[PDB]
A = this chain, B = another copy of it.
């Protein structure tokens, strides 16, 4: 558990070739950017990757 303040442009790399920047700065909603490859076991919100990663993939398709 590591809690580090952020609001500009972070850059962490967990796995073996990733890159996740937690922008932090934004109007009302903060646009968080998560850059990660589909090689390592990566799980996220269905809708999230459903609109960014894969255009409507769902469980089985």
Contacts and interface: CB of A to CB of B under 8 A. Distances in A.
B3 A32 contact: yes
Interface of A: 1-7, 10-16, 18, 20, 22, 24, 26, 29-36, 40-45, 48-49, 52-53
A36 B6 contact: no
Given A7-B29, A13-B44, A15-B41, 10 more contacts: A2-B33, A4-B31, A5-B29, A5-B30, A6-B30, A12-B20, A15-B15, A22-B22, A22-B30, A40-B40
Contact of A40 (B11, B14, B36): B14
Nearest to A1: B35
Contacts of A7: 29-30
